[PDB]
Design an enzyme around this catalytic site. Structure first.
Site, PDB file in Angstrom:
ATOM      1  N   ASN A 144     -27.755 -39.601  78.793  1.00  0.00           N
ATOM      2  CA  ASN A 144     -28.855 -39.427  79.112  1.00  0.00           C
ATOM      3  C   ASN A 144     -29.140 -39.073  77.184  1.00  0.00           C
ATOM      4  O   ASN A 144     -30.052 -38.816  77.623  1.00  0.00           O
ATOM      5  CB  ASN A 144     -29.414 -37.939  79.641  1.00  0.00           C
ATOM      6  CG  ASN A 144     -28.230 -36.379  79.418  1.00  0.00           C
ATOM      7  OD1 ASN A 144     -27.710 -36.648  78.461  1.00  0.00           O
ATOM      8  ND2 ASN A 144     -27.931 -35.928  80.928  1.00  0.00           N
ATOM      9  N   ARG A 193     -31.036 -27.104  74.746  1.00  0.00           N
ATOM     10  CA  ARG A 193     -30.616 -26.361  75.603  1.00  0.00           C
ATOM     11  C   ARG A 193     -31.635 -24.935  75.066  1.00  0.00           C
ATOM     12  O   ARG A 193     -32.050 -24.657  73.926  1.00  0.00           O
ATOM     13  CB  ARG A 193     -28.817 -25.433  74.853  1.00  0.00           C
ATOM     14  CG  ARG A 193     -28.235 -26.472  75.618  1.00  0.00           C
ATOM     15  CD  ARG A 193     -28.494 -26.058  76.949  1.00  0.00           C
ATOM     16  NE  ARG A 193     -27.175 -27.224  77.630  1.00  0.00           N
ATOM     17  CZ  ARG A 193     -26.976 -28.059  77.913  1.00  0.00           C
ATOM     18  NH1 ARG A 193     -28.586 -28.905  78.155  1.00  0.00           N
ATOM     19  NH2 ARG A 193     -26.546 -28.946  78.807  1.00  0.00           N
ATOM     20  N   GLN A 243     -31.247 -21.748  83.216  1.00  0.00           N
ATOM     21  CA  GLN A 243     -31.347 -22.873  83.842  1.00  0.00           C
ATOM     22  C   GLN A 243     -32.835 -22.878  84.296  1.00  0.00           C
ATOM     23  O   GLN A 243     -33.965 -22.663  84.253  1.00  0.00           O
ATOM     24  CB  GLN A 243     -30.750 -23.538  83.850  1.00  0.00           C
ATOM     25  CG  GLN A 243     -29.976 -24.900  82.953  1.00  0.00           C
ATOM     26  CD  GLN A 243     -31.919 -25.562  82.455  1.00  0.00           C
ATOM     27  OE1 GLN A 243     -32.479 -26.162  81.690  1.00  0.00           O
ATOM     28  NE2 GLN A 243     -32.264 -26.558  83.702  1.00  0.00           N
ATOM     29  N   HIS A 255     -35.822 -28.720  83.384  1.00  0.00           N
ATOM     30  CA  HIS A 255     -34.879 -29.685  82.747  1.00  0.00           C
ATOM     31  C   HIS A 255     -35.195 -30.929  83.117  1.00  0.00           C
ATOM     32  O   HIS A 255     -34.156 -31.337  84.451  1.00  0.00           O
ATOM     33  CB  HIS A 255     -34.030 -28.860  82.594  1.00  0.00           C
ATOM     34  CG  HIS A 255     -32.683 -29.450  82.096  1.00  0.00           C
ATOM     35  ND1 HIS A 255     -31.344 -28.523  81.894  1.00  0.00           N
ATOM     36  CD2 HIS A 255     -32.865 -30.243  81.663  1.00  0.00           C
ATOM     37  CE1 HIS A 255     -30.802 -29.802  80.994  1.00  0.00           C
ATOM     38  NE2 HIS A 255     -30.816 -30.376  80.957  1.00  0.00           N
TER      39      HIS A 255
HETATM   40  N1  LIG Z   1     -31.073 -33.318  79.463  1.00  0.00           N
HETATM   41  C1  LIG Z   1     -31.747 -33.018  78.565  1.00  0.00           C
HETATM   42  O1  LIG Z   1     -32.268 -31.748  78.225  1.00  0.00           O
HETATM   43  C2  LIG Z   1     -30.443 -33.260  77.304  1.00  0.00           C
HETATM   44  C3  LIG Z   1     -29.363 -34.371  78.260  1.00  0.00           C
HETATM   45  C4  LIG Z   1     -27.495 -34.567  76.884  1.00  0.00           C
HETATM   46  C5  LIG Z   1     -27.348 -33.049  75.901  1.00  0.00           C
HETATM   47  N2  LIG Z   1     -28.412 -32.205  76.079  1.00  0.00           N
HETATM   48  C6  LIG Z   1     -27.754 -31.421  74.823  1.00  0.00           C
HETATM   49  O2  LIG Z   1     -28.067 -32.331  74.116  1.00  0.00           O
HETATM   50  C7  LIG Z   1     -26.703 -32.290  72.846  1.00  0.00           C
HETATM   51  C8  LIG Z   1     -26.955 -33.174  72.313  1.00  0.00           C
HETATM   52  O3  LIG Z   1     -26.219 -34.136  72.935  1.00  0.00           O
HETATM   53  P1  LIG Z   1     -25.898 -35.429  72.332  1.00  0.00           P
HETATM   54  O4  LIG Z   1     -25.296 -37.096  73.095  1.00  0.00           O
HETATM   55  O5  LIG Z   1     -26.370 -35.659  70.985  1.00  0.00           O
HETATM   56  O6  LIG Z   1     -24.392 -35.250  71.553  1.00  0.00           O
HETATM   57  P2  LIG Z   1     -23.514 -35.403  70.154  1.00  0.00           P
HETATM   58  O7  LIG Z   1     -22.880 -36.935  70.395  1.00  0.00           O
HETATM   59  O8  LIG Z   1     -22.398 -34.319  70.380  1.00  0.00           O
HETATM   60  O9  LIG Z   1     -24.234 -34.686  68.977  1.00  0.00           O
HETATM   61  C9  LIG Z   1     -24.275 -33.213  68.450  1.00  0.00           C
HETATM   62  C10 LIG Z   1     -24.592 -33.114  67.328  1.00  0.00           C
HETATM   63  O10 LIG Z   1     -25.078 -32.258  66.668  1.00  0.00           O
HETATM   64  C11 LIG Z   1     -24.535 -31.709  65.639  1.00  0.00           C
HETATM   65  N3  LIG Z   1     -23.920 -30.173  65.166  1.00  0.00           N
HETATM   66  C12 LIG Z   1     -24.687 -29.862  63.892  1.00  0.00           C
HETATM   67  N4  LIG Z   1     -24.971 -28.681  63.964  1.00  0.00           N
HETATM   68  C13 LIG Z   1     -23.672 -28.658  64.977  1.00  0.00           C
HETATM   69  C14 LIG Z   1     -22.777 -27.310  65.318  1.00  0.00           C
HETATM   70  N5  LIG Z   1     -23.160 -26.676  64.523  1.00  0.00           N
HETATM   71  N6  LIG Z   1     -21.265 -27.443  66.730  1.00  0.00           N
HETATM   72  C15 LIG Z   1     -21.800 -28.468  67.099  1.00  0.00           C
HETATM   73  N7  LIG Z   1     -22.673 -29.567  66.705  1.00  0.00           N
HETATM   74  C16 LIG Z   1     -23.205 -29.389  65.654  1.00  0.00           C
HETATM   75  C17 LIG Z   1     -23.409 -32.491  65.582  1.00  0.00           C
HETATM   76  O11 LIG Z   1     -23.185 -33.083  64.050  1.00  0.00           O
HETATM   77  P3  LIG Z   1     -21.739 -32.507  63.108  1.00  0.00           P
HETATM   78  O12 LIG Z   1     -21.015 -31.914  64.378  1.00  0.00           O
HETATM   79  O13 LIG Z   1     -21.179 -33.429  63.069  1.00  0.00           O
HETATM   80  O14 LIG Z   1     -21.946 -32.229  62.838  1.00  0.00           O
HETATM   81  C18 LIG Z   1     -23.358 -33.338  66.304  1.00  0.00           C
HETATM   82  O15 LIG Z   1     -24.603 -35.293  65.717  1.00  0.00           O
HETATM   83  C19 LIG Z   1     -26.157 -31.670  74.329  1.00  0.00           C
HETATM   84  O16 LIG Z   1     -24.798 -30.849  73.932  1.00  0.00           O
HETATM   85  C20 LIG Z   1     -26.076 -30.716  75.536  1.00  0.00           C
HETATM   86  O17 LIG Z   1     -26.819 -29.410  74.818  1.00  0.00           O
HETATM   87  C21 LIG Z   1     -29.519 -31.960  76.271  1.00  0.00           C
END
Ligand SMILES: NC(=O)c1ccc[n+]([C@@H]2O[C@H](COP(=O)([O-])OP(=O)(O)OC[C@H]3O[C@@H](n4cnc5c(N)ncnc54)[C@H](OP(=O)(O)O)[C@@H]3O)[C@@H](O)[C@H]2O)c1
Ligand SMILES: NC(=O)c1ccc[n+]([C@@H]2O[C@H](COP(=O)([O-])OP(=O)(O)OC[C@H]3O[C@@H](n4cnc5c(N)ncnc54)[C@H](OP(=O)(O)O)[C@@H]3O)[C@@H](O)[C@H]2O)c1
Lengths: 381, 381
Positions: free
Chosen positions: A147, A285, A314, A333
């Site tokens: 997603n 989140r 949530q 959500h």
């Molecule tokens: N329906 C929704 O609302 C929905 C759907 C999907 C996901 N989400 C949320 O969005 C988040 C990100 O999704 P995504 O697919 O973009 O994930 P991803 O591909 O794992 O990207 C996460 C990003 O967070 C960055 N980041 C910066 N500071 C961080 C820290 N302290 N700890 C961990 N990561 C850090 C990471 O870069 P670096 O770690 O290299 O610094 C990375 O670029 C998910 O984990 C989830 O919580 C929400």
């Protein structure tokens, strides 16, 4: 035998659909950067169906029961007496979606004597307590990139909605008004503003690619900087820290996972670093942002808008202050459970279950915890 | 001497703003493609102020009274007894904005004995009857490009808003609900869909550039095809006629002026050509779409959503059917009068008046009718 406990949200109140607005879903070849779409061995559903509710069952019943597994589906998830906590004691697998999350709290994992897999139908496993899962050897997996484009689209929508004052303006149209001045006294173009993303992951970078043609200045931060080429394609401006970034931004969007290092990163202290009338969109989140700090910052005018689909707890209480604050563009959500997204993460859920049960390796992208330690995408949290 | 009649919308209901949400508007250097921003001899306002309501006066009173012209500002514009119709009898100039339009109907232009200039503070002069202006040598001018990018943002925000089911979902949030399945039983990703623009002008092409990174397939139509060079940049697919384009499009956006050849181009007949569950975004003019044809197309499921900010008549009656239909994302006419946009077309308004009264030529791009014939941009209708 192997009991699969599956927590899904209720069907629509007017009933599970007998008709969808359209006749088929667009064909997505692969994800940006090259990750392949889920590859289950088959699917028992038509893409575009409502897979994420109790009647949808993620298209898993016929598959699991064919291989002799028990399959339990419920929307009753909150409470010690809930169907979830009662069927939890001997479940081998737990599937829930971040949108209606079966909270696997420390004491609940303690009760789940037979649990070997906790499967996030979606992205983000912050409803599963990592400490206990690592301690107990449980595998934790999620459908990576399922997603991320869905949320990236939601993000741009809410940015534009906040800057241009969409939600209050639409109220005037539905309520019988016109009221141009009332709408536009808080309405700006996004053009030329500076937008900053916390996180340039799959969602964050998709947001930044989509914002580039709006003629905005794009800034971003995370722990490991992106390759210069990417930065130069989009014209990204890098920051070592979040706090170094906020004072530059007219708009800030949050796109990072929820773990302790990032919890309450938006709070009364950090909120002082923002320009007056800053906008925040949080589709990541709810706990990334101190709830009442957002409200206070809205009431004082530090923020000209807050929008997102993520809350905490949530199933947000009916009294959740974000629902009624001024300059809100919130939604439940839903970003990650669009009918297009459901088709992908329901196949991903099945791919993982097939891999889990057949002794084949769960994609490394999919893994958060395996063998008593962080693994795959989880080691990079 | 020389009377300028100016029709502006009311102040906000709770009063003209004293504290704005932000401190300053981003600085735009030129418009995309190279057109210079308005070039008056001075401006008597601060960009970011509310210039389009009666207290804002477009920042024009001090300039006009300095040169001996009379300056009349009113919001009372509709009706034979309205202040506008009683002051039009001897006005030399009429200024009104599309969002609160002083309709220069044939019968009113007949009463306007001293009229020589009809200045549209905005884009689109369809509230002024073109035929009568040509017949009478009146000059008709508008601030071309002043808010084309503002509308392009509103369009993409409303496309996403419709495809993803933003408005009904936000209603679930504000009313205390969660109701995931109720929200997403009508929510899709935009990624991979086909979007078609009627018109690739200043707005249309800005919309298409902004949609490119959403990984949608981009079609368009108009009378004259764009340079393939440009077509190949955005991957545009050209169509000779609209009726040729509609069957391909999951989303259709209208971005053309209102003339006879475009009036009611969306009607019960052409709507049969659209895919089931099509989306229409109309930020151009209300009469491009037959009002009741849209309503009927919504109720039957032909359309999965209609959204725009432009209606007819404007101001739209409280009973306008588009305000309460299902799958609507309407806003009052505000896209082109965001506070950022007002700064530009209030300067353009002053530029044209200076040119007019000083005997200097109005820019070709501003001119619609002059000296008894179409002129400049109006020559390209
Ligand atoms: N329906 C929704 O609302 C929905 C759907 C999907 C996901 N989400 C949320 O969005 C988040 C990100 O999704 P995504 O697919 O973009 O994930 P991803 O591909 O794992 O990207 C996460 C990003 O967070 C960055 N980041 C910066 N500071 C961080 C820290 N302290 N700890 C961990 N990561 C850090 C990471 O870069 P670096 O770690 O290299 O610094 C990375 O670029 C998910 O984990 C989830 O919580 C929400
Ligand atoms: N809601 C708002 O706030 C707002 C703000 C600004 C403008 N508007 C509306 O949007 C319209 C377009 O604005 P713009 O700045 O993009 O104008 P523009 O630069 O003049 O572009 C108009 C486009 O319409 C195309 N077109 C297609 N079929 C046409 C036909 N039959 N007759 C005339 N033109 C035709 C033209 O290309 P071809 O000549 O090749 O056909 C041209 O690309 C305005 O006239 C106004 O009605 C609304």
């Amino acid at each position: 035998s192997a009991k699969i406990l599956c927590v899904l949200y209720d069907d629509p109140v007017d009933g599970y659909p007998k008709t969808y607005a359209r006749d088929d879903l667009p064909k997505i070849d692969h994800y940006p950067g090259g990750q392949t779409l889920p590859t289950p061995k088959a699917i028992d559903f038509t893409p575009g169906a409502l897979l994420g509710s109790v009647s949808g069952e993620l298209g898993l019943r016929k598959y699991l029961e064919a291989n002799g597994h028990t399959f339990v589906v419920t929307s009753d998830k909150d409470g010690p007496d809930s169907v979830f906590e009662r069927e939890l004691v001997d479940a081998d697998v737990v599937i829930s979606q971040p949108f209606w999350p079966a909270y696997l709290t420390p004491e609940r994992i303690a009760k789940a004597k037979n649990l070997k897999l906790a499967l996030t139908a979606g992205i983000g496993s912050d409803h599963v307590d990592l400490q206990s899962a690592i301690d107990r050897g449980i595998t934790v997996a999620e459908v990576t990139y399922c997603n991320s484009i869905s949320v990236a689209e939601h993000v741009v929508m809410m940015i534009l909605g906040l800057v241009r004052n969409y939600i209050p303006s639409h109220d005037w149209a539905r309520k019988g008004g016109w009221n141009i001045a009332d709408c536009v006294e808080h309405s700006y173009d996004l053009e030329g503003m500076t937008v900053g993303s916390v996180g340039a992951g799959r969602i964050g970078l998709a947001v930044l690619r989509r914002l580039a043609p709006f003629d905005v200045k794009l800034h971003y931060t995370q722990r490991h900087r992106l390759p210069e080429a990417v930065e130069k394609e989009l014209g990204l401006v890098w920051h070592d820290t979040r706090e170094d970034m906020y004072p530059h931004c007219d708009v800030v969007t949050l796109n990072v996972p929820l773990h302790p290092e990032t919890e309450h990163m938006i709070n009364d202290e950090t909120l002082k670093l923002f320009k007056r009338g800053a906008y925040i969109v949080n589709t990541a989140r709810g706990k990334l942002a101190d709830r009442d700090a957002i409200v206070r910052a809205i009431e004082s005018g530090q923020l000209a808008g807050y929008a997102g689909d993520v809350w905490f707890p949530q199933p947000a209480p009916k009294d959740h202050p974000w629902r009624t604050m001024k300059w809100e563009g919130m939604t439940p959500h839903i970003s990650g459970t669009s009918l297009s997204a459901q088709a992908r993460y329901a196949a991903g859920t099945r791919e993982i279950l097939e891999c889990f049960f057949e002794g084949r390796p769960i994609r490394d992208e999919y893994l958060i915890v395996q063998g008593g330690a962080l693994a795959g995408t989880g080691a990079k949290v």
